[PDB]
Design a protein around this ligand. Sequence first.
Ligand code: HEM
Ligand code: HEM
Lengths: 51, 51, 105, 378, 108, 48, 75, 49, 111, 60
Amino acid sequence: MLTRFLGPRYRQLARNWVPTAQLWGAVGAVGLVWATDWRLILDWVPYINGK
Amino acid sequence: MLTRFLGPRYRQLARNWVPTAQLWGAVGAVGLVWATDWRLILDWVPYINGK
Amino acid sequence: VSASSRWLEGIRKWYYNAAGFNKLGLMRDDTIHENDDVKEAIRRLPENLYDDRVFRIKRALDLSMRQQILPKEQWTKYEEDKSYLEPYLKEVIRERKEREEWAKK
Amino acid sequence: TNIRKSHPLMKIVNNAFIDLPAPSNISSWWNFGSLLGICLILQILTGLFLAMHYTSDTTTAFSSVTHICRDVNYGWIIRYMHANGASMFFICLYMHVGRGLYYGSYTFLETWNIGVILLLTVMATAFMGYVLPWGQMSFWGATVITNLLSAIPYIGTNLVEWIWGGFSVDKATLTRFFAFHFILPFIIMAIAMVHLLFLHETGSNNPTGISSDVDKIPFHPYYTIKDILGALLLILALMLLVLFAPDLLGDPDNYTPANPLNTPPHIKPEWYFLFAYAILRSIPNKLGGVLALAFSILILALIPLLHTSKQRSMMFRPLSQCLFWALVADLLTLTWIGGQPVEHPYITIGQLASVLYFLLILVLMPTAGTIENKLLKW
Amino acid sequence: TNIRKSHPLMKIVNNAFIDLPAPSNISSWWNFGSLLGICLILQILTGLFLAMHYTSDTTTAFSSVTHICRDVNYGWIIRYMHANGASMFFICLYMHVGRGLYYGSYTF
Amino acid sequence: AEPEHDHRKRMGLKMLLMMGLLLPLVYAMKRHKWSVLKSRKLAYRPPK
Amino acid sequence: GRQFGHLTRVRHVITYSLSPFEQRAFPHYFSKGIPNVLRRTRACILRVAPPFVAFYLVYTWGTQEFEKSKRKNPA
Amino acid sequence: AAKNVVSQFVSSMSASADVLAMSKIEIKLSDIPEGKNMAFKWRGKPLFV
Amino acid sequence: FVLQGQWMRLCTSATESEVLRGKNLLRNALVSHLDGTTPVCEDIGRSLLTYGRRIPLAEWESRIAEVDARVVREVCSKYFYDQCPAVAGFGPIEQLPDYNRIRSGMFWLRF
Amino acid sequence: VAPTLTARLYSLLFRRTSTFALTIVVGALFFERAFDQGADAIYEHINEGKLWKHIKHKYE
Ligand code: HEM
Ligand code: HEM
């Protein structure tokens, strides 16, 4: 019954938190990547090619 | 400064709890004796001479 | 109206007897699961109903304790079952949904 | 005034099992919480004594265990109380989760989820427990199961070798499990305290599912003694097993020292996992089976969102009572299947019970609820 | 109102290390309580990892320990953090009992 | 395979004999305390 | 929370009770006892039993089909 | 500093006296007659010839 | 809890000093009560119906006088110690202790 | 004799939690023994598979 959250205001609310939720994903991405020294991802980064 | 507990009433109080404190020692005596099967003590008891 | 209504009604009367709360002297609305809407409606009941409702529930809990049941004579007959709480609950839901509509704008 | 009420320590005890308002209502199905508690300390108590002798290296793993039962004084009752206590623990665990579902106790979101965590935890605890004596089944049951994680894409391999401490179920793999099997029951116990903390916010639910505030009774003397009596019964059950049929619930195959090249034909997990084992092999897919096996226990956490009836308990709802016992029976089928070889009838009937388990929970029970409401004009 | 204050779990945390009224006064000698706490989990954490390798039979007792420092990856820092953590634990312990006596904290 | 065989069965005999005495005994203890709730009678006396 | 004195509101209900040292612990234990249990059994058989026999039938059959599938006659 | 310690503790569960890993096994073929599956031990794992 | 605590205490440990207070209280109550014609006439009438005699103050004093601590803890024990109460509750009694617990408070484990 | 039994038992030994305890501990002593006699005597009577073996093999 998630219809309670369906309306104009809720839609404005979602847009307002978008940049924040996006940036929070940027943090989690780099966060995992750096913490596991992601071979796959890190190779693209200049200066972090310690091989 | 245990003088606060020194007087007639306190003396009556001690006498009143004497039979109780005595009986509570009887319980602890037999209690240890039976629980450790006290060789030393139990030998005197008729019927508990399992040797 | 005809055979049709009676059939559904008798299917309903059958489940009712099978549900079996009436054996504990309870009423349909006594068994309602208490949530926010329900708590408020219980709160809005007038003195008499609220009192009766508590005694009914007490009679039942007491029975359900010794796992006995009421004599057949005193079970609560379908028909005779008062939906005392319904109108209150409906209004409590109807109130909430208004806030909820207002919250969308 | 009264010390029991105001001393910072006793307060707890008092408000937890002395003055706590309890329904006059709760029946035998409510005893399992205390029995689970008793099972816990029992596993901790005997388990400890077993650790004062058991040695955790492949060389003496099996040996030490034998040393325990023959040389160590009464090491045998201890050993058997331990083994059987684990089973008793699972019986009560399943009974407890049973009561919760039937009676709608799961409406207590937090209390129940802590319980799911209690479930996985005691489960994870026992999986490791049985690898310890380093029996054929231990090594092999340890091999079958661990490997399951090797289905997780891109990482199953690395992960399985990581929890293995090598390329196989080696020496690293035994000491590891000893250590965790020692620390897990302590964490279980703390998590069980939070179970109780959260439970105490609402008080207990009851057979009728109707609120009982109107008829509450003090936990002592009623439920201290109703709890005492039911523990004695648990002692009967437990002792009946260790003192008469000690191996009844155990595989004879684990009495043969492990052998990495052997591989028994028989190969099954302990009884308390058979239903889940069934569900797993009923799927002809590596990822599927495992995913499905996970979903099999983690679904206890979906239950509250599937509640549909206007009544909490199932006591007054027969369509659901029927569906409930079908669910029990269907798990009994799953147990049975999982204990049988993956051949003839068993395959397809095992695949049927599986779909059913999920249909019964994910669709049949929710629907029966909506119908029972409709039938009451609710 | 505020979740930190009323959630049955956080209440604890909150009333134990967030809102708890504390003297503006307490000095460095008061740090030993938290350090004792840290020493405890540290001994528990490294201690655990040491138990995933150490074997408890005379035959391999010493051996397993050596196995830890040479073969087990970083088993040496773990082993040494453990050993030294025990000493650190005692230093703080003695410091803590020191503060108590000097400051009369024992009236509790 | 099981040197303990005989010993346990002796305890088992004691376990049944004991439980055959404790079980009813605890029941009666629990019966006696619940007495109060089993025979409680209710009456509802609303005004008017 | 919790505690007696703050649970809920109730009025007009009397409760007569009796000292345990004044009554018997097993009044009509079998007299009223057994009738009740039958009644409770009756009340629940149709809801509890059916799934269990359904398992039972599938159990014994499934077993027979297994055993009898592992033999061959002609061919 | 956090990863380092965490990694070092993570690493503590992998390598060891465990790069036995393995060989080049030499098996006499005239010992396995037609139709038989002979299993040997190689890299801690069963090897079928 | 407190009321029961006192009965128990008196049953098991009445001190001597307090018994003199209680005695004094009674002598003062008796004599203070037998003041004015009405109370006295009522005492004559009731006493004859219940004692068959009229008990002279001098005798009640004698009876009071005879009580000392031992008597108190003896006599209180006979009627209070481990006996079943008759309990009557009216009002907002949600917290009136359960009978079992009221009954348990009629004896104590130290004694 | 019958009512006064449970009665006297209460009178002289049950009120005071003291005696009540003094008796159960003392009562546990005699009981533990008398139970182990009868119990073992029972275990023997249903068996006789060991012990009388001794009268045979040794006696020196
Ligand atoms: C570590 C094993 C567990 C222990 C020691 C434990 C302990 C307890 C205790 C002492 C109670 C008191 C009331 C009663 O038993 O009914 C209780 C009730 C409850 N437990 Fe558990 N529990 C455990 C596992 C579970 C599991 C597996 C679940 C479900 C996933 C669960 C969810 C509940 C719920 C919902 C209740 C409320 C029951 C009601 O009031 O009807 N707990 N538990
Ligand atoms: C922290 C307390 C515990 C300790 C110290 C402990 C330690 C041990 C040890 C050393 C063994 C191997 C010796 C043997 O098999 O007899 C073992 C076996 C086992 N224990 Fe525990 N454990 C504890 C808690 C548990 C818990 C919570 C469970 C789960 C109910 C559990 C279930 C098992 C199982 C399944 C086995 C292997 C089966 C067997 O007995 O042969 N124990 N435990």
